[PDB]
Amino acid sequence: MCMKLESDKTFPIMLNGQVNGYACVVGGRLMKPLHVEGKIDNEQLAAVKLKKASMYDLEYGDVPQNMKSDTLQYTSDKPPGFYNWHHGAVQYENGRFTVPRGVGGKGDSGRPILDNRGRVVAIVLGGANEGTRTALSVVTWNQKGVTIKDTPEGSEPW
Binding site for a second copy (CB under 8 A): 14, 16-18, 27, 43-44, 47, 64-69, 71, 73, 93-94, 98, 102, 105, 129-133, 135, 152
> Among this protein's residues, is 86 annotated catalytic?
no
Q: Any catalytic annotation for residue 115? A: no
Q: Which is nearer to a second copy, 7 or 16 (CB)?
A: 16
Please state, in angstroms and rounded to a whole number, the distance separating the CA atoms of residues 88 and 3: 9
Q: Which of 7, 54, 57, 86 is catalytic?
A: 57
108: annotated active-site residue: no
Q: Find the shortest distance in angstroms from Cβ 54 to a second copy.
A: 26
Q: What is the smallest separation between the CB atom of 17 and a second copy, expressed in angstroms?
A: 5
- As annotated, the active-site residues are 35, 57, 109
